[PDB]
Structure 1
Amino acid sequence: PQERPRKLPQLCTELQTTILECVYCKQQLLRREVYDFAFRDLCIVYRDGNPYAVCDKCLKFYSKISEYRHYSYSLYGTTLEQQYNKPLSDLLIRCINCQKPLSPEEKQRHLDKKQRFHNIRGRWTGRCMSC
């Protein structure tokens, strides 16, 4: 639970390996999908103790799953800092396309496009540098 490393940056250590299996594709992953799990910072999926990862084809799908379904509301730049008054660096915002946690510099992806930030599943999202 608290012991099992929910980040592959910590699971590369506890596998006692050197710098990868996803449960969606049910297959063995690659080193392109160890950088982005360290970069999208997703949680390690567990199968009643059996830890697995995501693959990018199933990062681009199973987050596409929720974002067209679990949609709640999208708000202007004038409000997302107003009604929160929480720092944008502290503001836990990931990406809506690739689930990458937004750097605050990359929080001008909607603040500096005269755009709006999105919230899926009660967990706010948006566009990133790759999108």
Structure 2
Amino acid sequence: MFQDPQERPRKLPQLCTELQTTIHDIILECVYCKQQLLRREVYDFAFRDLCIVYRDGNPYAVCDKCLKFYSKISEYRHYSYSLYGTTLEQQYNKPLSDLLIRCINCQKPLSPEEKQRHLDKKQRFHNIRGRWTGRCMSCSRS
């Protein structure tokens, strides 16, 4: 059981080993709809570097539809300001390569290649509730 608030695994791979099971074996519920994830979604949850949410010692993930939906709502709600990558580097005194930026549509962390694309196409990065976001390749093409 994961009824200890502090000492339960956070990332799906860890939960796999903690339950002596593999990503190919495990079945999980989405934290909003409590519907079961498709295996494709489970993989993507691992790829998106997201955290397991726990209620009463039970683990929950998030499916694709819910994640996109709530992310889009959060964009509409806590948008702050948009900067160019160059400007952003100066505000944070670090190169964009190193700065933590996620996909605004699907939370997937952005690769330095995608970060470069933002600089190449003179596109801005959006601050939402104090965290920075951009658009990954799979969301700038749709």
TM-score normalised by structure 1 residue count: 0.90
CA 1:120–1:52 in 2, change beyond 3 Å: closer, same or farther?
A: same
Helix, strand or coil for the counterpart of 1:37? helix
Counterpart Cα distance in 2 of 1:48 and 1:73 = 37
Helix, strand or coil for the counterpart of 1:81? helix
CA 1:126–1:15 in 2, change beyond 3 Å: closer, same or farther?
A: same
Listed one character per residue, the Cα deviations across residues 68-99 of structure 1 (whole Å, up to 9, x for unaligned) are 11111110122011111224343111110110
Q: Please state how far the C-alpha of 1:65 moved relative to its aligned partner.
A: 1.9
Q: In the alignment, what sits opposite 2:106? A: 98
Question: Which has the larger displacement, 69-78 or 44-53?
Answer: 44-53
Given that residues 20 and 30 in structure 1 are in contact (C-alpha distance below 8 angstroms), is that contact kept between their aligned partners in structure 2?
no
TM-score normalised by structure 2 residue count: 0.83
Q: In the alignment, what sits opposite 2:133? A: 125
Alignment partner for residue 54 of structure 1, among 24, 39, 62? Answer: 62
Helix, strand or coil for the counterpart of 1:25? coil
Given that residues 109 and 128 in structure 1 are in contact (C-alpha distance below 8 angstroms), is that contact kept between their aligned partners in structure 2?
no
Q: Which runs of 4+ in 1 moved over 6 A?
A: none
1:9 correspondence with 2:30:
no
CA 1:89–1:3 in 2, change beyond 3 Å: closer, same or farther?
A: farther
Counterpart Cα distance in 2 of 1:60 and 1:36 = 13
Given that residues 67 and 96 in structure 1 are in contact (C-alpha distance below 8 angstroms), is that contact kept between their aligned partners in structure 2?
yes
Alignment partner for residue 37 of structure 2, among 29, 41, 59? Answer: 29
Helix, strand or coil for the counterpart of 2:15? helix
Q: Where does structure 1 lack aligned partners over 5 or more consecutive residues?
A: none
Listed one character per residue, the Cα deviations across residues 23-71 of structure 1 (whole Å, up to 9, x for unaligned) are 2121121211122111111111121432200000111111112111111
Given that residues 30 and 63 in structure 2 are in contact (C-alpha distance below 8 angstroms), is that contact kept between their aligned partners in structure 1?
yes
Given that residues 20 and 33 in structure 1 are in contact (C-alpha distance below 8 angstroms), is that contact kept between their aligned partners in structure 2?
no
Given that residues 85 and 96 in structure 2 are in contact (C-alpha distance below 8 angstroms), is that contact kept between their aligned partners in structure 1?
no
Aligned residues: 131
Helix, strand or coil for the counterpart of 1:43? coil
Q: Please state how far the C-alpha of 1:2 moved relative to its aligned partner.
A: 4.1
Given that residues 22 and 29 in structure 1 are in contact (C-alpha distance below 8 angstroms), is that contact kept between their aligned partners in structure 2?
yes
